[PDB]
Design a protein around this nucleic acid. Structure first.
Ligand SMILES: [Ca+2]
Ligand SMILES: [Ca+2]
Length: 254
DNA sequence: GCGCGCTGAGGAGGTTTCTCTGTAAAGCGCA
DNA sequence: GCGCTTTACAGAGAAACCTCCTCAGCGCGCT
C-alpha cells in the first residue's frame, strides 16, 4: 500500500518529534512538530516536501541553531497526519499521546476548559513478538534509527591505537521496544536499564556491526538526513579497521 | 461594511533523554 | 597464557521534546 516512506516518517516523529495540545488563552493549539539541530535543515525540508504541509522555522538560543517543522493546521492534521498515524501506528507508549491527540481533535475539543489533565499511560501495549512481526517495522526502524540511533568509532584505551565501532540506541520506558530492536537485529549484548529507567542497547562485535549494515542494505527505505552522513562516515572508518573490513562486505554506495 | 468568535503563524521559555564516548574487566582462540 | 575482542556498565550535557503567549485576519452573522 501507500509508500513505506510514511512508515519511516512515523518512526522518525516517534523518535525526534512530538504530538502536542498546548493552551493559548481560552483556546488550544494542536501541533505535530519536529525540532532538529541546524545540521538537519535539509531533512526538515524533505519532510515538508513529502507531507506537503507545515511551517518551517529557525531559531537561535545561546549560540546553537535549530530548525522546526510545525503542523498546527487542524484540517491538514485531520486529512494528512491522522491517516498516516492510523496506517502505521507508533510502537512505544508515545502511542498514547497520539491516541489522545486524535480523540480530542476529531471530537472537536477547542476550549482549554474541555481538555482533561493528561498523563501518558505506561500500560504496555505490545510484546516483542507483536512489534517484530508487524509488516512495516523495518520501514519504521530506519526512521527510528534516524532519530535515536548513534554510529560512533572510538579508542578502546587512550595510550593505544585499537579502535571500537559501535551502534547504539536508547529509550526511556521503552524496554519492550528496545528489546524488540535487539531481537529483530539479533543482537545479544544485554540491555542496560539506567537509574532513570532509560533502556540502553549498545553493540560493538564484528557480527553485530555486520547485522546492522546488512539490515540497512535490506531495508525498504534509507536514512535521508544527517544520520546518513554519520553512517557513511562510520563506514568510511570501518574500511580502515582490520577485524571489521576483513569479515564484512562493506557497501560503497549506500 | 462591521463586529464576534476562533485561527495558524510567529515568537519564544523549560527541562532531560537521548547521543556520544568511553573504561575496567572478562572472554576466546590457538604452530 | 598472552594478545586480540567483547562485555557490563555508565557519565556528560545538548539536541531534543513539549510548552504557552501575542497578533493580523479568517468566515460568519446580520448586510
Ligand atoms: Ca525521543
Ligand atoms: Ca535525533
Amino acid at each position: 500500500g501507500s509508500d513505506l516512506t510514511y512508515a519511516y516518517l512515523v518512526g522518525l516523529y516517534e523518535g525526534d518529534g512530538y504530538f502536542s495540545i498546548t493552551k493559548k488563552g481560552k483556546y488550544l493549539t494542536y501541533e505535530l512538530g519536529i525540532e532538529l539541530s541546524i545540521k538537519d535543515v535539509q531533512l526538515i525540508y524533505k519532510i515538508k516536501k513529502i507531507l506537503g504541509i507545515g511551517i518551517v522555522s529557525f531559531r537561535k538560543r545561546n549560540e546553537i541553531e535549530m530548525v522546526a517543522l510545525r503542523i498546527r493546521d487542524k484540517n491538514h492534521l485531520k486529512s494528512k497526519i491522522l491517516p498516516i498515524f492510523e496506517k502505521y501506528p507508533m510502537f512505544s507508549n508515545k502511542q498514547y499521546d497520539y491516541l489522545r491527540f486524535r480523540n480530542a481533535l476529531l471530537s472537536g475539543i477547542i476550549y482549554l476548559e474541555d481538555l482533561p489533565d493528561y498523563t501518558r499511560s505506561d500500560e504496555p501495549l505490545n510484546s516483542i513478538e507483536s512489534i517484530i512481526n508487524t509488516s512495516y517495522f523495518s520501514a519504521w526502524l530506519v526512521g527510528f534509527i534516524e532519530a535515536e540511533g548513534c554510529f560512533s568509532v572510538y579508542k578502546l584505551n587512550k595510550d593505544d591505537d585499537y579502535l571500537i565501532a559501535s551502534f547504539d540506541i536508547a529509550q526511556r520506558d521503552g524496554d519492550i521496544l528496545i528489546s524488540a530492536i535487539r531481537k529483530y537485529l539479533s543482537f545479544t549484548t544485554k540491555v542496560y536499564l539506567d537509574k532513570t529507567n532509560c533502556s540502553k542497547l549498545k553493540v560493538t562485535s564484528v557480527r553485530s556491526v555486520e547485522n546492522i549494515i546488512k539490515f540497512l542494505q535490506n531495508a525498504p527505505v534509507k536514512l535521508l538526513g544527517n544520520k546518513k552522513l554519520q553512517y557513511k562516515l562510520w563506514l568510511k572508518q570501518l574500511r580502515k579497521i582490520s577485524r571489521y573490513s576483513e569479515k564484512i562486505k562493506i557497501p560503497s554506495n549506500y
